[PDB]
């Protein structure tokens, strides 16, 4: 019964943000990042909580005020968040993901270790957001946890980098590494294949050309996201990249042949940190990661 | 030999920010707040350090990169900082203060406890600065420590709320408390008397009137600074207030009689925290502090 999770997500977020938009607004304080609040949904029902078809669950909203601030800094009006996520069926896919009917939000699960680490990331995330306004890291809208009979599933709601609205003719999941970085042929048979690194280097060996103008932003704001990531001892993150070819949100690019492109990029899987690996190893992953994307994958 | 401190301040800041403006710029990370860097000035001299008339000292710059960011967010070009402070004599006054020849910077000493607490305040300070852009808290430009033979003097360089450039006809140091809040008559004989709270309530008993427009900013951004301060368990801070009467930086106000004013305000002495006092006591100081200034001291 996946349906028992979709509903518990949808029920609880409504109750969480619903009750918040009545409380009046205030600034975020360091105190707000470690708050975790819990509301209880009996199948019978309660004075606070409506009854439902699914079984009894507690719904846990992590760091609620801080994600209110993050959502607003991101443009996510509360009424839209709630409608998109809690008032329309959720599609699965095949860590475990979902999407909104809208295709604007992605949900993902996260190991207890990864959610706990997100909580510690918040202040540095706040700092990066408020310094590097064109950063590529995940746009985190909320951290939640549904408590089943004796298990916890932990969800982080975040932004969809590749929306149905723009048609993606190429997909890539890149890391700057080579080992097994080649699309499992099971995946290679989708019409929407998310090719990996070796796949890239042969299919697109003259690269993705960028103007002297826009290539500089990338090189600059990636050096920034990599300095942020290695600071926090993070690894195994990919630069996900969808390409679209022509005959408004993304980057404009020129093809090896010369067709005009619009490239859509973002850094994903940033919650595995190492705070046995070496002292200087996450720095190695960053320097590689960046010297790759900003030489092999995008050039001037 | 106060002169031996003025010089050690001036020598070390030059060396600290001088060496920094050659290093290339990057974003602030949580890691940067706890850094403390030390450079050594022998009276003989060194390859790194010039010789001097004063005795040997180590100069300690606290959280250097974070204060570079704070200075820039505040408008303080590095060349100006350095000239003002390190390239012109420093005036004393009669905790121990100085000023720049310019009258734009104030220096103050801080107990080891207070400096150590500033270091912990940095991330919440970063958060407040980047949320409440019209906040009243001290503008901190740097935290430094000069190590004498066996003693340490710890300085925080910050902004002068009452500059010689505007003539102040009134001064006040207000807290929302009454006990001994009445200017020591020793001070009461200066031509520039910094009256306290009881002094205010009788000399200006019809208050400082403010437009419905500007009175709202104050009430709003003070409720914000007080929510920040009590969060950090801080007390004994005063709202310092200088008044100027007419016949461009400050607030415009109307007098009980009706003359047109320009009021200059700021919150000072915020480094005494309590992280024996009650759980809810710093909150009491804030609610009082604010319900005072935004009823007795400024009205609509
Ligand atoms: N924010 C996002 N926007 C668009 N697509 C995404 C997003 N996050 C994940 N995906 C899709 O899921 C894949 C990456 O999943 P991710 O690596 O984040 O999760 P995971 O289960 O931890 O993966 P891995 O097993 O590689 O560590 C990508 O190849 C991408 O196509
Ligand atoms: N940033 C500033 N701008 C202008 N004047 C200031 C500033 N800081 C301090 N002063 C002057 O010094 C006085 C306040 O000193 P402050 O209370 O900050 O230091 P202190 O020695 O800890 O004082 P106290 O003994 O009251 O705790 C004020 O009355 C004011 O006139
Ligand atoms: Ca991955
Ligand atoms: Ca992972
Ligand atoms: Ca004081
Ligand atoms: Ca004090």
Coordinates of N, CA, C and O in Angstrom, one line a residue, chain A residues 18-170:
Chain A
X18 N -1.0 24.5 6.3 CA -2.3 25.2 6.6 C -2.3 25.9 7.9 O -2.5 27.1 8.0
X19 N -1.9 25.2 9.0 CA -1.8 25.8 10.3 C -0.7 26.9 10.4 O -0.8 27.7 11.3
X20 N 0.2 26.8 9.5 CA 1.3 27.8 9.6 C 0.9 29.2 9.0 O 1.2 30.2 9.5
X21 N 0.1 29.1 7.9 CA -0.3 30.4 7.2 C -1.3 31.2 8.0 O -1.5 32.3 7.7
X22 N -1.8 30.6 9.1 CA -2.5 31.4 10.1 C -1.6 32.1 11.1 O -1.8 33.3 11.4
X23 N -0.6 31.4 11.6 CA 0.4 32.0 12.4 C 1.1 33.2 11.6 O 1.3 33.1 10.4
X24 N 1.4 34.3 12.3 CA 1.9 35.5 11.6 C 3.4 35.4 11.4 O 4.1 34.7 12.2
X25 N 3.9 36.1 10.4 CA 5.3 35.8 9.9 C 6.3 36.6 10.7 O 6.1 37.6 11.3
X26 N 7.5 36.0 10.8 CA 8.7 36.5 11.5 C 9.9 35.9 10.8 O 9.8 35.0 10.0
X27 N 11.0 36.5 11.2 CA 12.4 36.2 10.6 C 12.8 34.8 11.1 O 12.4 34.3 12.2
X28 N 13.7 34.2 10.4 CA 14.3 32.9 10.8 C 15.4 33.2 11.7 O 16.2 34.1 11.5
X29 N 15.5 32.4 12.8 CA 16.6 32.4 13.8 C 17.3 31.1 13.8 O 16.7 30.1 13.4
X30 N 18.6 31.1 14.2 CA 19.3 29.8 14.3 C 18.4 28.8 15.0 O 18.4 27.6 14.6
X31 N 17.7 29.2 16.0 CA 16.9 28.3 16.8 C 15.9 27.5 15.9 O 15.6 26.3 16.2
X32 N 15.5 28.1 14.8 CA 14.4 27.5 14.0 C 14.9 26.3 13.2 O 14.0 25.5 12.8
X33 N 16.2 26.1 13.1 CA 16.6 25.0 12.2 C 16.5 23.6 12.8 O 16.3 22.6 12.1
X34 N 16.6 23.5 14.1 CA 16.6 22.3 14.8 C 15.2 21.8 15.3 O 15.0 20.7 15.7
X35 N 14.2 22.8 15.3 CA 12.8 22.4 15.6 C 12.4 21.3 14.7 O 12.7 21.2 13.5
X36 N 11.7 20.3 15.3 CA 10.9 19.3 14.6 C 9.6 19.2 15.3 O 9.5 19.1 16.6
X37 N 8.4 19.3 14.6 CA 7.1 19.4 15.1 C 6.3 18.2 14.6 O 6.4 17.8 13.5
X38 N 5.4 17.6 15.5 CA 4.7 16.4 15.2 C 3.2 16.6 15.5 O 2.8 17.1 16.5
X39 N 2.4 16.2 14.5 CA 1.0 16.2 14.6 C 0.5 14.7 14.3 O 1.1 14.0 13.5
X40 N -0.6 14.3 15.0 CA -1.0 12.9 15.0 C -2.4 12.7 14.3 O -3.3 13.4 14.6
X41 N -2.4 11.8 13.3 CA -3.6 11.6 12.5 C -4.3 10.2 12.8 O -3.9 9.2 12.1
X42 N -5.2 10.1 13.7 CA -5.9 8.8 13.9 C -6.9 8.5 12.8 O -7.5 9.5 12.2
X43 N -7.0 7.2 12.4 CA -8.0 6.9 11.4 C -9.4 7.2 11.8 O -10.2 7.5 10.9
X44 N -9.7 7.0 13.1 CA -11.0 7.5 13.6 C -11.1 9.0 13.3 O -12.2 9.4 12.7
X45 N -10.1 9.8 13.6 CA -10.2 11.2 13.4 C -10.0 11.9 14.8 O -10.1 11.3 15.8
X46 N -9.8 13.2 14.7 CA -9.6 14.0 15.9 C -10.3 15.4 15.8 O -10.8 15.7 14.7
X47 N -10.2 16.2 16.8 CA -10.7 17.5 16.8 C -9.8 18.4 15.9 O -10.3 19.2 15.1
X48 N -8.5 18.1 15.9 CA -7.5 18.8 15.1 C -7.5 18.1 13.7 O -7.4 18.8 12.7
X49 N -7.6 16.8 13.7 CA -7.2 16.1 12.5 C -8.4 15.4 11.9 O -9.2 14.8 12.6
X50 N -8.6 15.4 10.6 CA -9.7 14.7 10.0 C -9.4 13.2 9.9 O -8.2 12.8 9.9
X51 N -10.4 12.4 9.8 CA -10.3 10.9 9.7 C -10.0 10.6 8.2 O -10.2 11.4 7.3
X52 N -9.5 9.4 8.0 CA -9.1 9.0 6.7 C -9.1 7.5 6.5 O -9.3 6.7 7.4
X53 N -9.0 7.1 5.2 CA -9.0 5.7 4.8 C -7.7 4.9 5.3 O -7.8 3.8 5.6
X54 N -6.6 5.6 5.3 CA -5.3 5.0 5.6 C -5.2 4.8 7.1 O -6.0 5.2 7.9
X55 N -4.2 4.0 7.5 CA -4.0 3.7 9.0 C -3.4 4.8 9.8 O -2.8 5.7 9.2
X56 N -3.5 4.7 11.1 CA -3.0 5.8 12.0 C -1.5 6.1 11.7 O -0.7 5.1 11.6
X57 N -1.2 7.3 11.7 CA 0.2 7.8 11.5 C 0.4 9.1 12.2 O -0.5 9.9 12.4
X58 N 1.7 9.3 12.6 CA 2.2 10.6 13.0 C 2.9 11.3 11.8 O 3.6 10.6 11.1
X59 N 2.7 12.6 11.6 CA 3.3 13.3 10.6 C 4.2 14.3 11.2 O 3.8 15.1 12.0
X60 N 5.5 14.3 10.8 CA 6.5 15.1 11.4 C 7.0 16.1 10.4 O 7.5 15.7 9.3
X61 N 6.8 17.4 10.7 CA 7.4 18.5 9.9 C 8.7 19.0 10.5 O 8.7 19.4 11.7
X62 N 9.8 18.9 9.8 CA 11.1 19.3 10.2 C 11.3 20.8 9.9 O 11.1 21.3 8.8
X63 N 11.9 21.5 10.9 CA 12.3 22.9 10.7 C 11.3 23.8 10.0 O 11.7 24.5 9.1
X64 N 10.1 23.8 10.5 CA 9.0 24.4 9.6 C 9.2 25.8 9.2 O 9.0 26.1 8.0
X65 N 9.5 26.7 10.2 CA 9.7 28.1 9.8 C 10.8 28.3 8.8 O 10.7 29.2 8.0
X66 N 11.9 27.5 8.9 CA 13.0 27.7 8.0 C 12.6 27.4 6.6 O 13.0 28.1 5.6
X67 N 11.7 26.3 6.4 CA 11.3 26.0 5.1 C 10.2 27.0 4.6 O 10.1 27.2 3.4
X68 N 9.4 27.6 5.5 CA 8.6 28.6 5.0 C 9.5 29.7 4.3 O 9.2 30.2 3.2
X69 N 10.6 30.1 5.0 CA 11.4 31.1 4.4 C 12.1 30.6 3.1 O 12.3 31.4 2.2
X70 N 12.5 29.4 3.1 CA 13.1 28.9 1.9 C 12.1 28.9 0.7 O 12.4 29.5 -0.4
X71 N 10.9 28.4 0.9 CA 9.9 28.4 -0.1 C 9.7 29.9 -0.7 O 9.7 30.1 -1.9
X72 N 9.5 30.8 0.2 CA 9.3 32.2 -0.2 C 10.5 32.7 -1.0 O 10.3 33.4 -2.0
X73 N 11.7 32.5 -0.5 CA 12.9 32.9 -1.2 C 13.0 32.3 -2.6 O 13.7 32.8 -3.5
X74 N 12.3 31.2 -2.8 CA 12.3 30.4 -4.0 C 11.1 30.7 -4.9 O 11.0 30.2 -6.0
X75 N 10.1 31.5 -4.5 CA 8.9 31.9 -5.3 C 7.8 31.0 -5.1 O 6.8 31.0 -5.9
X76 N 7.7 30.1 -4.1 CA 6.7 29.1 -4.0 C 5.6 29.6 -3.0 O 5.6 29.3 -1.8
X77 N 4.6 30.3 -3.6 CA 3.4 30.7 -2.8 C 2.8 29.5 -2.1 O 2.7 28.4 -2.6
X78 N 2.4 29.7 -0.8 CA 1.8 28.6 0.0 C 0.6 28.0 -0.6 O 0.5 26.8 -0.5
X79 N -0.3 28.8 -1.2 CA -1.5 28.1 -1.8 C -1.1 27.2 -2.9 O -1.7 26.1 -3.0
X80 N -0.1 27.5 -3.7 CA 0.4 26.7 -4.8 C 1.0 25.4 -4.3 O 0.7 24.3 -4.8
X81 N 2.0 25.5 -3.5 CA 2.6 24.4 -2.8 C 1.5 23.4 -2.4 O 1.5 22.2 -2.8
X82 N 0.5 23.9 -1.6 CA -0.5 23.0 -1.1 C -1.3 22.3 -2.1 O -1.6 21.1 -2.1
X83 N -1.7 23.1 -3.2 CA -2.6 22.5 -4.2 C -1.8 21.4 -5.0 O -2.3 20.3 -5.0
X84 N -0.8 21.8 -5.7 CA 0.2 20.9 -6.3 C 0.4 19.6 -5.6 O 0.3 18.5 -6.2
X85 N 0.8 19.7 -4.3 CA 1.2 18.5 -3.6 C 0.0 17.8 -3.0 O -0.2 16.5 -3.2
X86 N -0.8 18.5 -2.2 CA -1.9 17.8 -1.4 C -3.2 17.7 -2.1 O -4.1 17.1 -1.4
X87 N -3.5 18.2 -3.3 CA -4.8 18.3 -3.8 C -4.9 17.7 -5.2 O -5.7 18.2 -6.0
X88 N -4.0 16.8 -5.5 CA -3.9 16.1 -6.8 C -3.1 14.9 -6.7 O -2.2 14.8 -5.9
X89 N -3.4 13.8 -7.4 CA -2.7 12.5 -7.2 C -1.2 12.6 -7.4 O -0.8 13.5 -8.2
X90 N -0.5 11.8 -6.7 CA 1.0 11.8 -6.9 C 1.4 10.6 -7.8 O 1.0 9.5 -7.5
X91 N 2.2 10.9 -8.8 CA 2.8 9.8 -9.6 C 4.1 9.3 -8.9 O 4.9 10.1 -8.5
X92 N 4.3 7.9 -9.0 CA 5.5 7.3 -8.5 C 6.6 7.4 -9.7 O 6.4 8.0 -10.7
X93 N 7.7 6.7 -9.5 CA 8.6 6.4 -10.5 C 9.4 5.2 -10.2 O 9.4 4.7 -9.0
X94 N 10.1 4.6 -11.1 CA 11.0 3.4 -11.0 C 11.7 3.2 -12.3 O 13.0 2.9 -12.3
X95 N 16.7 4.5 -3.4 CA 15.8 5.6 -3.0 C 14.6 5.7 -3.8 O 14.6 5.3 -5.0
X96 N 13.5 6.2 -3.2 CA 12.1 6.1 -3.8 C 11.5 7.5 -4.0 O 11.4 8.3 -3.1
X97 N 11.1 7.8 -5.3 CA 10.7 9.2 -5.7 C 9.2 9.2 -6.0 O 8.5 8.2 -6.3
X98 N 8.6 10.4 -6.1 CA 7.3 10.7 -6.5 C 7.3 12.0 -7.3 O 8.4 12.7 -7.4
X99 N 6.2 12.4 -8.0 CA 6.1 13.7 -8.5 C 4.7 14.2 -8.3 O 3.8 13.5 -7.9
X100 N 4.5 15.5 -8.4 CA 3.2 16.1 -8.4 C 2.5 16.0 -9.8 O 3.2 15.8 -10.8
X101 N 1.2 16.0 -9.8 CA 0.5 16.0 -11.0 C 1.0 17.1 -11.9 O 1.2 16.9 -13.1
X102 N 1.4 18.2 -11.3 CA 1.9 19.4 -12.1 C 3.2 19.2 -12.8 O 3.5 20.0 -13.7
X103 N 4.0 18.2 -12.3 CA 5.4 18.0 -12.7 C 6.3 19.1 -12.2 O 7.4 19.3 -12.7
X104 N 5.9 19.9 -11.2 CA 6.8 20.9 -10.6 C 7.5 20.6 -9.4 O 8.6 21.1 -9.2
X105 N 7.0 19.6 -8.6 CA 7.7 19.2 -7.4 C 8.1 17.7 -7.5 O 7.4 16.9 -8.1
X106 N 9.3 17.4 -7.1 CA 9.7 16.0 -6.9 C 9.8 15.7 -5.4 O 10.2 16.6 -4.6
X107 N 9.3 14.5 -5.0 CA 9.5 14.0 -3.6 C 10.6 12.9 -3.7 O 10.7 12.3 -4.8
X108 N 11.4 12.7 -2.6 CA 12.4 11.7 -2.5 C 12.4 11.2 -1.1 O 12.1 12.0 -0.2
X109 N 12.8 10.0 -0.9 CA 13.0 9.5 0.5 C 14.5 9.7 0.8 O 15.3 9.8 -0.1
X110 N 14.8 9.7 2.1 CA 16.1 9.9 2.6 C 16.4 9.1 3.8 O 15.5 9.0 4.7
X111 N 17.5 8.4 3.8 CA 17.9 7.6 5.0 C 18.0 8.6 6.2 O 18.3 9.8 6.1
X112 N 17.7 8.1 7.4 CA 17.7 8.8 8.7 C 19.0 9.6 8.8 O 19.0 10.7 9.3
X113 N 20.1 9.0 8.4 CA 21.4 9.7 8.4 C 21.4 10.9 7.5 O 21.9 11.9 7.9
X114 N 20.8 10.8 6.3 CA 20.7 11.9 5.4 C 19.7 13.0 5.9 O 20.1 14.2 5.7
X115 N 18.6 12.6 6.4 CA 17.7 13.7 6.9 C 18.4 14.4 8.1 O 18.4 15.6 8.1
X116 N 18.9 13.7 9.1 CA 19.6 14.3 10.2 C 20.7 15.2 9.7 O 21.0 16.2 10.3
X117 N 21.4 14.9 8.6 CA 22.4 15.7 8.0 C 21.9 16.9 7.4 O 22.5 18.0 7.4
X118 N 20.8 16.8 6.7 CA 20.1 18.0 6.2 C 19.9 19.0 7.3 O 20.2 20.2 7.1
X119 N 19.4 18.6 8.4 CA 19.2 19.5 9.5 C 20.4 20.3 9.8 O 20.4 21.5 10.1
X120 N 21.6 19.6 9.8 CA 22.8 20.4 10.1 C 23.2 21.3 8.9 O 24.0 22.2 9.2
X121 N 22.8 20.9 7.7 CA 23.2 21.7 6.6 C 22.5 23.1 6.5 O 23.0 24.0 6.0
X122 N 21.2 23.2 7.1 CA 20.4 24.3 7.0 C 21.2 25.7 7.1 O 21.1 26.5 6.2
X123 N 21.9 25.9 8.2 CA 22.5 27.3 8.3 C 23.5 27.6 7.1 O 23.5 28.7 6.6
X124 N 24.3 26.6 6.7 CA 25.2 26.8 5.6 C 24.4 27.0 4.3 O 24.8 27.7 3.4
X125 N 23.3 26.3 4.2 CA 22.4 26.4 3.0 C 21.8 27.8 3.0 O 21.8 28.5 2.0
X126 N 21.3 28.3 4.1 CA 20.9 29.7 4.3 C 22.0 30.6 3.8 O 21.7 31.7 3.2
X127 N 23.2 30.3 4.2 CA 24.3 31.2 3.8 C 24.6 31.2 2.4 O 24.9 32.3 1.8
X128 N 24.4 30.1 1.7 CA 24.8 30.0 0.3 C 23.7 30.7 -0.5 O 24.0 31.6 -1.3
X129 N 22.5 30.3 -0.3 CA 21.3 30.9 -0.9 C 21.4 32.4 -0.9 O 21.2 33.1 -1.9
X130 N 21.7 33.0 0.3 CA 21.8 34.5 0.5 C 23.1 35.1 0.0 O 23.3 36.3 0.2
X131 N 24.0 34.3 -0.6 CA 25.2 34.9 -1.2 C 25.3 34.7 -2.7 O 25.5 35.6 -3.4
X132 N 25.0 33.4 -3.1 CA 25.2 33.0 -4.5 C 23.7 32.8 -4.9 O 23.1 31.7 -4.7
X133 N 23.2 33.8 -5.6 CA 21.8 33.8 -5.9 C 21.4 32.9 -7.1 O 20.3 32.5 -7.2
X134 N 22.4 32.5 -7.9 CA 22.3 31.6 -9.0 C 22.8 30.2 -8.8 O 23.2 29.5 -9.7
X135 N 22.9 29.8 -7.5 CA 23.5 28.5 -7.1 C 22.6 27.4 -7.7 O 21.4 27.6 -8.1
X136 N 23.3 26.2 -7.9 CA 22.7 25.0 -8.6 C 22.2 23.9 -7.6 O 21.7 22.9 -8.0
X137 N 22.4 24.1 -6.3 CA 22.1 23.1 -5.4 C 20.6 22.8 -5.3 O 19.8 23.7 -5.8
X138 N 20.1 21.7 -4.9 CA 18.7 21.4 -4.7 C 17.9 22.6 -4.0 O 18.4 23.2 -3.1
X139 N 16.7 22.9 -4.5 CA 15.9 23.9 -3.9 C 15.0 23.1 -2.9 O 14.0 22.4 -3.3
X140 N 15.3 23.1 -1.6 CA 14.6 22.3 -0.6 C 13.4 23.1 -0.1 O 13.5 24.2 0.4
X141 N 12.2 22.5 -0.3 CA 11.0 23.1 0.1 C 10.4 22.6 1.4 O 9.7 23.3 2.1
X142 N 10.8 21.4 1.8 CA 10.4 20.8 3.1 C 11.0 19.5 3.4 O 11.4 18.8 2.5
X143 N 11.1 19.2 4.7 CA 11.6 17.9 5.1 C 10.5 17.3 6.0 O 10.1 18.0 7.0
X144 N 10.0 16.1 5.7 CA 8.9 15.5 6.4 C 9.2 14.1 6.7 O 10.0 13.4 6.0
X145 N 8.5 13.5 7.6 CA 8.6 12.1 8.0 C 7.3 11.5 8.4 O 6.6 12.0 9.3
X146 N 6.9 10.4 7.7 CA 5.6 9.7 8.0 C 6.0 8.5 8.8 O 6.8 7.6 8.4
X147 N 5.4 8.4 10.0 CA 5.7 7.2 10.9 C 4.6 6.2 10.8 O 3.5 6.3 11.2
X148 N 5.0 5.1 10.1 CA 4.1 3.9 9.9 C 4.1 3.1 11.2 O 4.6 3.6 12.3
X149 N 3.6 1.9 11.2 CA 3.4 1.1 12.5 C 4.6 1.1 13.3 O 4.6 1.4 14.5
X150 N 5.8 0.8 12.8 CA 7.0 0.8 13.5 C 8.2 1.4 12.6 O 9.3 1.4 13.1
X151 N 7.9 1.7 11.4 CA 8.9 2.3 10.5 C 8.7 3.8 10.3 O 7.6 4.3 10.5
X152 N 9.7 4.5 9.9 CA 9.7 5.8 9.4 C 10.1 5.9 8.0 O 11.2 5.4 7.6
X153 N 9.3 6.6 7.1 CA 9.8 7.1 5.8 C 9.9 8.6 5.8 O 9.1 9.3 6.4
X154 N 11.1 9.1 5.4 CA 11.5 10.4 5.5 C 11.6 11.1 4.1 O 12.3 10.6 3.3
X155 N 10.8 12.1 3.9 CA 10.7 12.7 2.6 C 11.3 14.1 2.6 O 11.1 14.9 3.6
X156 N 11.9 14.5 1.5 CA 12.4 15.9 1.3 C 11.7 16.3 0.0 O 12.0 15.7 -1.1
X157 N 10.8 17.3 0.0 CA 10.2 17.9 -1.2 C 11.1 18.9 -1.8 O 11.6 19.8 -1.1
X158 N 11.3 18.8 -3.1 CA 12.3 19.7 -3.8 C 11.8 19.9 -5.2 O 10.8 19.4 -5.7
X159 N 12.7 20.6 -6.0 CA 12.3 21.1 -7.3 C 12.6 20.1 -8.4 O 13.6 19.5 -8.4
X160 N 11.7 20.1 -9.4 CA 12.0 19.2 -10.6 C 12.9 19.9 -11.6 O 12.5 21.0 -12.1
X161 N 14.1 19.4 -11.8 CA 15.0 20.1 -12.8 C 14.5 19.9 -14.2 O 14.8 20.8 -15.0
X162 N 13.8 18.8 -14.5 CA 13.4 18.5 -15.9 C 11.9 18.3 -15.9 O 11.4 17.2 -15.7
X163 N 11.2 19.4 -16.2 CA 9.7 19.3 -16.2 C 9.2 18.9 -17.6 O 9.8 19.1 -18.6
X164 N 8.0 18.2 -17.5 CA 7.4 17.7 -18.7 C 7.2 18.8 -19.7 O 7.2 18.6 -20.9
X165 N 7.0 20.1 -19.2 CA 6.6 21.2 -20.1 C 7.6 21.4 -21.2 O 7.2 21.6 -22.3
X166 N 8.9 21.4 -20.9 CA 9.9 21.5 -21.9 C 10.2 20.1 -22.4 O 10.4 19.2 -21.5
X167 N 10.3 19.8 -23.7 CA 10.7 18.4 -24.1 C 12.2 18.3 -24.0 O 12.9 19.1 -24.6
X168 N 12.6 17.3 -23.3 CA 14.0 17.0 -23.3 C 14.4 15.9 -24.2 O 13.9 14.8 -24.2
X169 N 15.3 16.2 -25.2 CA 15.8 15.3 -26.2 C 17.0 14.5 -25.7 O 17.3 13.5 -26.2
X170 N 17.7 15.1 -24.7 CA 18.8 14.4 -24.1 C 18.7 14.5 -22.6 O 18.2 15.5 -22.0

